[PDB]
């Protein structure tokens, strides 16, 4: 029940740890950051950088003109943190405006430090939790890169390096994913891009996590992507970005079960059903995507999903259906002028 939602939710957090181990000026800070994201979306990244540094300078100015900085709301630290992270994100251009002793990673560290400073402030915490999560996740990505490229780190296991920030990210994502956290406009598909770092980390090093941990953390991710666009009046364009991430997450999870299949001999039945289930969640989401953006090359993706179903299903009747659906999707794509790679071409020939 409702008390069970908290009893199980609590078990998720437990296994998770074990597994991983005036004022109106605030609204206007956010506006500057939001506008920087509008420019980024329009691919004018120089302007996006200007708006970002503008946000930071305005944050500094609010701070020095505030009698008591401990009264600045969480949303102030959240906006400032988000601006700092955006400098890291756009660092290739942003570095041009800075002294040479500056790094992308240092801006990620600052974004983390600034959001953490908000943990103490008054006010709604949603935007802060999102800022914290986004910054922790960019830190993960950079640590992965440092692990592959810095000689000092070569012999430290990636997971050892990175799990503490993965754990912190999940600590702040989990509450945002709850239905008790009402939607809020900083929760955009754009803002959730760092969720890809978490997904692939889990995928790439899933071999060290329980199944239950994966299912727990993956449903957090899915829940967030979906929430960023549940308002039925979200423009299709944004719905698209979220649904493609959800689809990536479903196919990734299917592939994880299919991987266990292609090794271990137990329990094929269990593994086949779970894999199929995610593959079918994929078809559903793909269909949702296809209504949002009917584009013939997408049919090749449907075909891939159906071939995976064909590959693992245990009854011939279903297998024949899947293969036929794949074939039909591939032919229609081609009939709509989509270039078929030799793979696909040969599958249509091999089939009929």
* 3-class SS string, the chain: CHHHHHHHHHHHHHHHHHHHCCCHHHHHHHHHHHHHHHHHHCCCHHHHHHHHHHHHHHHHHHHHCCCCHHHCCHHHHHHHHHHHHHHHHCHHHHHHHCCCCCCHHHHHHHHHHHHHHHCCCCCCCHHHHHHHHHHHHHHHHHHHHHHHHCHHHCCCCHHHHHHHHHHHHHHHHHHHHCCCCCCCCCCCCHHHCCHHHHHHHHHHCHHHCCHHHHHHHHHHHHHHHHHCCCCCCCCHHHHHHHHHHHHHHHHHHHHHHHHHHHCCCCCHHHHHHHHHHHHHHHHHHHHHHHHHCCCCCHHHHHHHHHHHHHHHCCCHHHHHHHHHHHHHHHHHHHHCCCCCCHHHHHHHHHHC
d(CA 119, CA 72): 11
**The tokens of 217 are what?**
């953390």
Q: Resolution of this entry in Å?
A: 2.2
Q: Closest by alpha carbon to 29, among 180, 161, 131, 146?
A: 131
* Contact assessment for residue 327 and residue 294, using Cβ atoms and an 8 Å cutoff: no
Q: Closest by alpha carbon to 211, among 279, 283, 274?
A: 274
Give the distance, in angstroms, between the CA of residue 277 and the centroid of all CA atoms in the same chain: 21
Method: X-ray
Angle at 262 between CA 257 and CA 268, to 5 degrees: 65
Give the count of alpha carbons within 13 A of 290, CB side only.
15
**The tokens of 68 are what?**
């008591």
* Contact assessment for residue 167 and residue 20, using Cβ atoms and an 8 Å cutoff: yes
| Buried b / exposed e along 249-274 (16+ C-beta atoms within 10 A) | bbbbbbebbbebbeeeeeeeeebbeb
Q: Closest by alpha carbon to 170, among 133, 131, 206?
A: 133
* Contact assessment for residue 192 and residue 245, using Cβ atoms and an 8 Å cutoff: yes
Angstrom CA distances, 199 to 102, 194, 254, 282, 312, stand at: 29, 9, 13, 16, 24
* Interruption sites in the chain after residues (C→N beyond 2.5 Å): 21
């Amino acid at each position: 029940a409702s008390l069970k939602k908290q009893q199980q939710l609590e078990k998720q957090k437990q296994e998770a740890s074990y597994e991983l181990s005036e004022e109106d000026n605030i609204s206007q800070l956010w506006g500057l950051y939001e506008m920087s994201r509008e420019k980024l979306e329009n691919d004018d990244i120089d302007a996006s950088v200007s708006l970002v540094f503008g946000t930071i300078h305005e944050a500094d100015r609010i701070l020095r003109n505030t009698e008591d900085i401990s009264t600045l709301p969480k949303d102030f630290h959240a906006a400032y943190s988000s601006a700092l992270l955006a400098v890291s994100e756009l660092f290739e251009i942003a570095q041009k405006r800075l002294k040479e002793t500056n790094t992308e990673e240092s801006y990620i560290d600052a974004a983390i430090e600034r959001a953490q400073l908000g943990l103490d402030a008054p006010g709604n915490e949603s935007r802060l939790f999102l800022a914290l999560a986004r910054a922790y996740l960019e830190k993960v990505r950079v640590l992965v890169w440092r692990h592959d490229n810095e000689e000092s780190l070569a012999n430290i296991p990636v997971t050892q390096l990175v799990n503490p920030y993965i754990e912190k990210a999940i600590q702040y994502l989990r509450p945002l994913a709850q239905d008790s956290t009402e939607y809020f406009d900083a929760l955009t598909p754009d803002s959730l891009r760092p969720l890809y770092i978490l997904s692939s980390y889990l995928f790439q090093f899933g071999d060290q996590f329980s199944e239950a941990f994966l299912l727990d953390v993956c449903s957090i991710i899915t829940a967030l992507w979906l929430k960023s666009v549940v308002d039925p009046n979200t423009p299709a364009y944004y719905k698209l970005i979220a649904q493609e991430a959800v689809l990536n997450n479903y196919t990734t999870f299917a592939e994880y079960y299919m991987d266990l299949l292609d090794n271990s001999e137990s329990n094929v039945d269990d593994l086949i059903n779970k894999a199929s289930s995610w593959l079918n969640n994929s078809v559903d989401t793909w269909n949702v995507i296809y209504t949002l953006d009917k584009s013939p090359e997408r049919l090749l993706k449907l075909a891939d999903i159906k071939m995976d179903l064909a590959q693992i299903v245990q009854d011939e009747a279903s297998q024949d259906n899947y293969l036929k659906e794949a074939c039909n999707a591939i032919k229609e794509a081609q009939g709509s002028g989509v270039e078929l790679s030799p793979d696909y071409v040969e599958f249509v020939e091999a089939y009929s």
